[PDB]
């Protein structure tokens, strides 16, 4: 969708693997600010918003 009409998605109640996206080089920029991108698979929160 457009930049001013950006799509919003809610993710909850499943198992999420971040290694597959972490190792993929098809993305030019992968900037993580909350925590270290390496330790994403260990700690987790109640929900995710995309």
């Amino acid at each position: 969708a457009s930049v001013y009409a950006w799509n919003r998605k809610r993710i909850s109640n499943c198992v999420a693997d971040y290694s597959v996206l972490y190792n993929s080089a098809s993305f030019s920029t992968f900037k993580c600010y909350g925590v270290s991108p390496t330790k994403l698979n260990d700690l987790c929160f109640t929900n995710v918003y995309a």
Partner: protein, 49 residues
């Protein structure tokens, strides 16, 4: 802007008390083998203020 003052940002492990490390090498931030080529998942730990 004085840039002579710099410090190490990345390291595989922590530092034991009362010791010095002067290893200025590329740091592998992911699974990509740097091999002294930098690039993705490969950064310079030393940087200034």
């Amino acid at each position: 802007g004085n840039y002579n003052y710099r410090y190490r940002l990345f390291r595989k492990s922590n530092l034991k008390p009362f010791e010095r490390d002067i290893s200025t090498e590329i740091y592998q931030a992911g699974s990509k083998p740097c091999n002294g080529v930098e690039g993705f998942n490969c950064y310079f730990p030393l940087q200034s203020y």
